Ligand binder design. Structure first.
Ligand SMILES: Nc1nc2c(ncn2[C@H]2C[C@H](O)[C@@H](COP(=O)(O)OP(=O)(O)OP(=O)(O)O)O2)c(=O)[nH]1
Ligand SMILES: Nc1nc2c(ncn2[C@H]2C[C@H](O)[C@@H](COP(=O)(O)OP(=O)(O)OP(=O)(O)O)O2)c(=O)[nH]1
Lengths: 197, 198
């Protein structure tokens, strides 16, 4: 009997690459703030962890900050997933699943996470499934190509993000495909694919 | 309500410095164990994480491995605290509180954990307090002098601990004192204090 079990409404998770328009898309729902639980834009927490910019330090030196940053991404997703609400509907930007299946996986391959770091995150993931309820009814995948995503990113112009390589966005693209289209990851609930170009 | 809430018996935590004799003390309880749930020797899980010796890496390279090590220390403590049992008593070696109030404190001070990593662990300690039930009814404190603790570390001769200086243990000792004697941390159920210099 997990933390947050039986407390959660029908839940939609908004997924897609960096710069796929996830926040923008959710913003359309803002006038319904009173009817829907909207948990958007988690980057803002990662940019300010009691005054520390974890997003910034992760980009500057990944072999040091990959793991603490991912640890914190996991915490914040867990806090949104299990956040309490009386509303009939919850919609979330991102989920614990993209952190696990896309980012963590990619940083393992790209070597930002050493084997030991990776195993830690993975045992934590096993324990979270066993102990904490993650409500998941529908994923909406804002599908984009890596070039489009790249362009949206540099226009938005986050100082932290100014050195993000297109290659990286292609690595991430693939993983979102493997997970959300080619059904290559263990997890499965309903997926709705939208084109966003 | 929290995970593991309602499912845990009266629970005792065995605390004290590195080398103070926690495992030894616990073995006195070994003939009883069909009636007592004994969760001993968590260092072993830290020495082999599907092959990886995190203890070794944390000692070889703290600025890089302190973070992921503490993160796994936390997990393994959570797995013990919330491990299910039908027995009327649980006795555990260490707890999540010594990692938070002794080791993490020290690693923050000696620079192994930068503010950002420390902030992250602290945020996690709060969410655990809200999500995960941690049963604690009694702590038994095996009080030693940092010098006896050192002798025992040397006699035991774990290869990971080969470079552990007396200063480290002095630092940790005063941290265990601030928590278990001066009560300068949150709760501490009751603390039974034991002289563990033979
Ligand atoms: N969600 C998530 N973001 C991560 C992770 N590791 C690094 N990041 C970074 C990549 C980005 O620089 C930043 C925000 O990425 P997201 O695509 O989650 O949010 P963003 O507002 O950029 O999405 P949007 O452009 O609104 O579709 O977080 C992770 O494990 N999970
Ligand atoms: N419990 C704990 N140990 C840590 C932490 N960070 C590093 N360590 C190291 C200190 C030691 O090298 C090793 C195990 O120390 P303990 O005092 O927990 O076990 P030990 O078997 O040395 O105690 P004992 O001799 O049985 O009283 O783990 C932490 O956050 N918590």
């Amino acid at each position: 009997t997990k933390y947050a079990e039986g407390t959660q409404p029908f839940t939609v998770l908004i997924e897609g690459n960096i710069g796929s328009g996830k926040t923008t898309y959710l913003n359309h729902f803002e006038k319904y703030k009173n009817d829907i639980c909207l948990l958007t834009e988690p980057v803002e927490k990662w940019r300010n962890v009691n005054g520390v910019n974890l997003l910034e330090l992760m980009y500057k030196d990944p072999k040091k900050w990959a793991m603490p940053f991912q640890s914190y991404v996991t915490l914040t997703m867990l806090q949104s997933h299990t956040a309490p609400t009386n509303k009939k509907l919850k919609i979330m930007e991102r989920s614990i699943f993209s952190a696990r299946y896309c980012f963590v996986e990619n940083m393992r391959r790209n070597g930002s996470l050493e084997q030991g770091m990776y195993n830690t995150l993975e045992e934590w993931y096993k324990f979270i499934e066993e102990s904490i309820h993650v409500q998941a009814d529908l994923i909406i995948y804002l599908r984009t190509s890596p070039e489009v995503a790249y362009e949206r990113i540099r226009q938005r112009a986050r100082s932290e993000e100014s050195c993000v390589p297109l290659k990286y966005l292609q690595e991430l693209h693939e993983l979102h495909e493997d997970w959300l289209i080619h059904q290559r990851r263990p997890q499965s609930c309903k997926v709705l694919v939208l084109d966003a170009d």
